[PDB]
Each structure stands twice: as C-alpha cells, then as structure tokens.
Design an enzyme around this catalytic site. Structure first.
Site, PDB file in Angstrom:
ATOM      1  N   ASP A 137     -82.969 -42.698  40.859  1.00  0.00           N
ATOM      2  CA  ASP A 137     -81.850 -43.087  41.219  1.00  0.00           C
ATOM      3  C   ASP A 137     -80.573 -42.294  41.434  1.00  0.00           C
ATOM      4  O   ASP A 137     -79.399 -42.381  41.334  1.00  0.00           O
ATOM      5  CB  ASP A 137     -81.267 -44.064  39.613  1.00  0.00           C
ATOM      6  CG  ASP A 137     -80.068 -45.025  40.061  1.00  0.00           C
ATOM      7  OD1 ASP A 137     -79.845 -45.176  41.275  1.00  0.00           O
ATOM      8  OD2 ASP A 137     -79.373 -45.457  39.258  1.00  0.00           O
ATOM      9  N   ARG A 141     -72.776 -41.054  42.564  1.00  0.00           N
ATOM     10  CA  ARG A 141     -72.101 -41.978  41.557  1.00  0.00           C
ATOM     11  C   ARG A 141     -72.695 -41.632  40.300  1.00  0.00           C
ATOM     12  O   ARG A 141     -72.093 -42.003  39.263  1.00  0.00           O
ATOM     13  CB  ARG A 141     -72.052 -43.396  42.125  1.00  0.00           C
ATOM     14  CG  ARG A 141     -73.536 -43.951  41.938  1.00  0.00           C
ATOM     15  CD  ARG A 141     -73.901 -45.467  42.154  1.00  0.00           C
ATOM     16  NE  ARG A 141     -75.236 -45.897  42.576  1.00  0.00           N
ATOM     17  CZ  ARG A 141     -75.793 -45.488  43.702  1.00  0.00           C
ATOM     18  NH1 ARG A 141     -75.341 -45.085  44.706  1.00  0.00           N
ATOM     19  NH2 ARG A 141     -77.244 -45.961  43.936  1.00  0.00           N
ATOM     20  N   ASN A 142     -74.000 -41.071  40.248  1.00  0.00           N
ATOM     21  CA  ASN A 142     -74.749 -41.067  39.133  1.00  0.00           C
ATOM     22  C   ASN A 142     -74.715 -39.415  38.598  1.00  0.00           C
ATOM     23  O   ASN A 142     -75.388 -39.121  37.665  1.00  0.00           O
ATOM     24  CB  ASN A 142     -75.821 -41.488  38.985  1.00  0.00           C
ATOM     25  CG  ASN A 142     -76.168 -43.069  39.017  1.00  0.00           C
ATOM     26  OD1 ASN A 142     -75.330 -43.629  38.500  1.00  0.00           O
ATOM     27  ND2 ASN A 142     -77.167 -43.524  39.628  1.00  0.00           N
ATOM     28  N   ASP A 155     -78.133 -40.442  34.528  1.00  0.00           N
ATOM     29  CA  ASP A 155     -78.614 -41.811  34.763  1.00  0.00           C
ATOM     30  C   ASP A 155     -80.142 -41.641  35.114  1.00  0.00           C
ATOM     31  O   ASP A 155     -80.849 -42.471  35.811  1.00  0.00           O
ATOM     32  CB  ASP A 155     -77.966 -42.678  35.890  1.00  0.00           C
ATOM     33  CG  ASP A 155     -78.164 -44.173  35.585  1.00  0.00           C
ATOM     34  OD1 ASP A 155     -77.810 -44.575  34.524  1.00  0.00           O
ATOM     35  OD2 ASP A 155     -78.493 -44.857  36.497  1.00  0.00           O
TER      36      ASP A 155
HETATM   37  N1  LIG Z   1     -71.444 -46.677  36.396  1.00  0.00           N
HETATM   38  C1  LIG Z   1     -72.093 -45.392  36.862  1.00  0.00           C
HETATM   39  C2  LIG Z   1     -71.141 -44.227  37.095  1.00  0.00           C
HETATM   40  C3  LIG Z   1     -69.931 -44.077  36.102  1.00  0.00           C
HETATM   41  C4  LIG Z   1     -70.434 -43.765  34.750  1.00  0.00           C
HETATM   42  C5  LIG Z   1     -69.290 -44.389  33.464  1.00  0.00           C
HETATM   43  N2  LIG Z   1     -68.186 -43.397  33.445  1.00  0.00           N
HETATM   44  C6  LIG Z   1     -68.040 -42.437  32.475  1.00  0.00           C
HETATM   45  N3  LIG Z   1     -68.892 -42.392  31.613  1.00  0.00           N
HETATM   46  C7  LIG Z   1     -69.297 -40.884  31.121  1.00  0.00           C
HETATM   47  N4  LIG Z   1     -68.092 -40.500  30.499  1.00  0.00           N
HETATM   48  C8  LIG Z   1     -66.819 -40.672  31.248  1.00  0.00           C
HETATM   49  C9  LIG Z   1     -66.959 -41.738  32.219  1.00  0.00           C
HETATM   50  C10 LIG Z   1     -65.575 -41.991  32.672  1.00  0.00           C
HETATM   51  O1  LIG Z   1     -65.100 -42.953  33.231  1.00  0.00           O
HETATM   52  N5  LIG Z   1     -64.536 -40.902  32.816  1.00  0.00           N
HETATM   53  C11 LIG Z   1     -63.168 -41.218  33.441  1.00  0.00           C
HETATM   54  C12 LIG Z   1     -62.038 -41.428  32.299  1.00  0.00           C
HETATM   55  C13 LIG Z   1     -61.094 -40.625  32.362  1.00  0.00           C
HETATM   56  C14 LIG Z   1     -60.071 -40.655  31.335  1.00  0.00           C
HETATM   57  C15 LIG Z   1     -60.021 -41.731  30.415  1.00  0.00           C
HETATM   58  F1  LIG Z   1     -58.892 -41.793  29.187  1.00  0.00           F
HETATM   59  C16 LIG Z   1     -61.160 -42.391  30.284  1.00  0.00           C
HETATM   60  C17 LIG Z   1     -62.329 -42.575  31.443  1.00  0.00           C
HETATM   61  N6  LIG Z   1     -70.456 -40.490  30.618  1.00  0.00           N
HETATM   62  C18 LIG Z   1     -71.924 -41.171  30.896  1.00  0.00           C
HETATM   63  C19 LIG Z   1     -72.326 -40.935  32.159  1.00  0.00           C
HETATM   64  C20 LIG Z   1     -73.424 -41.592  32.787  1.00  0.00           C
HETATM   65  C21 LIG Z   1     -73.671 -43.063  32.373  1.00  0.00           C
HETATM   66  C22 LIG Z   1     -74.372 -43.834  33.332  1.00  0.00           C
HETATM   67  C23 LIG Z   1     -74.555 -43.395  34.846  1.00  0.00           C
HETATM   68  N7  LIG Z   1     -73.661 -43.754  35.618  1.00  0.00           N
HETATM   69  C24 LIG Z   1     -73.260 -45.030  35.970  1.00  0.00           C
HETATM   70  O2  LIG Z   1     -73.791 -45.813  35.550  1.00  0.00           O
END
Ligand SMILES: N[C@H]1CCCCNc2nc(ncc2C(=O)NCc2ccc(F)cc2)NCCCCCCNC1=O
Ligand SMILES: [Cl-]
Ligand SMILES: [Cl-]
Ligand SMILES: [Cl-]
Length: 258
Positions: A137, A141-142, A155
């Site tokens: 994958d 984006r990952n 991911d």
């Molecule tokens: N949906 C796709 C891609 C995005 C994954 C989700 N986003 C996050 N996850 C992560 N950690 C931080 C963020 C985040 O969004 N940071 C912004 C923020 C700033 C400031 C604030 F206050 C809050 C969020 N770790 C997990 C990473 C991988 C998980 C799934 C793989 N990738 C996916 O499935």
C-alpha cells in the site's frame, strides 16, 4: 501465545478523529508512568471467523526499530482490535506536499529536501524488504513526517499505485512495492499531483499494457526520472531492489549543492 504486544484498554484514552479506515488521536499511559500521545487505527474486522491471525504480524511489527519505519506500540481490544501508533503532529507527507504550495504553509520545498524524503522512504522500504515484509500500500499519503522532519513508511499491515503484474493477477513481490515506490517518488517530485492525469482508474491496465508510464515532471532532473522509470519496468526482474534504489538516490543527493 506469549504476546507482550497487547495493551490493556484501560491504559488508553481516545480523542478526536484524525482521518477516515478510521483513525483517532489518543493518550497511552506508559510503563514509566508518563502518558504518550498516540494515533489509534480502528481495524474493522470480519469476526465470523478468526481477530487472531492478526496479532501475528503485529508482534513482528513491534520488533521493527528503524527510524524510517513507523513503530507499532501495541494493540488494544474494545471485539474491536485497535492498532496503537505514535502521533506525528506534522501529519502525512502527501498533505505536507500540497500545503507547501500554499503561502502560510511550508516554504517551497527545494529538491534536496524532496530527495531526502525519497531516501528516507527508500531506507524504510529497504529495512522491510530485508525482513521479507511486503507493504502492499505504499504511497505518499501513507508516509508520515516525524517531529524531526524525517519521513517514515506507515500502513504496512490504490489502482494507480499497483504494479502491472499485480493488476492482471493479484500477486505481490517486493518488486511490486518497488513500483509503488516509483509512483510515490513521482508524487513527491510533483508536490502532490494525482498520478496519471487524464487517465481514469478503469483505463489503467490497458494504459500500462500498451507500455505508457508516468510522464516526467517539469523540474525533475533526468537522473531522478530514470530512477523512478526503472521502478516501472514491465518485468519485475528488471526493476532494482530497494537497496539499489536507496544508494542511487543517496548518491544523487550528494551530487547536489546545499
Ligand atoms: N488516513 C491515511 C493517512 C493519514 C493518517 C492519520 N493521521 C495521523 N495519524 C498519525 N498521527 C498524526 C496524524 C495526523 O493527522 N496529524 C495532523 C494533526 C496535527 C495537529 C493536531 F492537533 C492533530 C492532528 N499516526 C498514524 C500514522 C499511520 C496510520 C494509518 C496510515 N495512513 C492512513 O490511514
Ligand atoms: Cl477512551
Ligand atoms: Cl495537484
Ligand atoms: Cl502522467
């Protein structure tokens, strides 16, 4: 079954949704008494069968320690398995790339920095490929931005990222990951364009069958485009390994000024 990989649900506090499967912020109470900000991925599963066969990889994945590979902290149950990951305030690289084209967002990313992104990912995929772990994958984006702006692959455990042999069949070698890495490089060099503009996802196998490949971007060095095109050779055997790619990119980066 000696799996010190599961985490008691009570040590975990869940907050806002960060993305949608569904990913939620959280706090993890650690063993030294301090609390860690975490990201919590809801893995919606089919519990007609077996929830198990799922704590297997996660225990291997917990044994991964490379700075370009996201760390698994553990797994929790609510029967709802939850994967516990570190929180990265700088988010995923694809979005960072788009933001960087807006004022207020990150400055224009110079090529040296763009290449360093590709090296990180190549390093991370090289680690995983040396442990015969397939990603399946890989895309910008990952990939995630750590607090120090190094990138890490995530991911592990899409049409326009899938190698051609994996569309006809559905088999995945590491050389199918190499193909997706080449697309990811193109994502990075284009500062976030969607792959194959003008081609719909239903047109993609025929597009690739007739040997069309992603076009070269406007500012992209010829040498970087050759590296990425090598990832899409029709024969997976002709594609390089991630260890070959990683050194090629490292060299090219060193061959540039600061
Ligand atoms: N949906 C796709 C891609 C995005 C994954 C989700 N986003 C996050 N996850 C992560 N950690 C931080 C963020 C985040 O969004 N940071 C912004 C923020 C700033 C400031 C604030 F206050 C809050 C969020 N770790 C997990 C990473 C991988 C998980 C799934 C793989 N990738 C996916 O499935
Ligand atoms: Cl909670
Ligand atoms: Cl775009
Ligand atoms: Cl294209």
């Amino acid at each position: 079954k000696l799996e010190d990989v599961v985490i008691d649900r009570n040590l975990l506090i869940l907050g806002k949704i960060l993305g949608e499967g569904s990913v939620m912020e959280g706090n993890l109470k650690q063993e030294d008494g301090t609390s860690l900000k975490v990201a919590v991925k809801t893995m919606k599963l089919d519990n007609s069968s077996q929830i198990e066969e799922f704590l297997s990889e996660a225990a291997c994945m917990k044994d991964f320690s490379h700075p370009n590979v996201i760390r698994l902290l553990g797994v929790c149950i609510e029967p709802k398995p939850m994967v516990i990951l570190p929180f990265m305030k700088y988010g995923d690289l694809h979005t960072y790339l788009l933001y960087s084209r807006l004022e207020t967002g990150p400055k224009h990313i110079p090529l040296q920095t763009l290449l360093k992104f590709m090296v990180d990912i190549a390093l991370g995929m090289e680690y995983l490929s040396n442990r015969n772990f397939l990603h399946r994958d890989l895309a910008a984006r990952n990939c995630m931005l750590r607090d120090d702006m190094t990138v890490c692959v995530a991911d592990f455990g899409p049409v326009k990222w899938i190698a051609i042999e994996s569309l006809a069949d559905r088999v995945y070698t590491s050389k199918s990951d190499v193909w997706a890495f080449g697309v990811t490089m193109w994502e990075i060099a284009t500062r976030g364009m969607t792959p194959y503009p003008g081609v719909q996802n239903h047109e993609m196998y025929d597009y690739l069958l007739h040997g069309h490949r992603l076009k070269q971007p406007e500012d992209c060095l010829d040498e970087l485009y050759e590296i990425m095109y090598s990832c899409w050779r029709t024969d997976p055997l002709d594609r390089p390994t991630f260890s070959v790619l990683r050194l090629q990119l490292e060299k090219l980066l060193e061959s540039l000024p600061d």
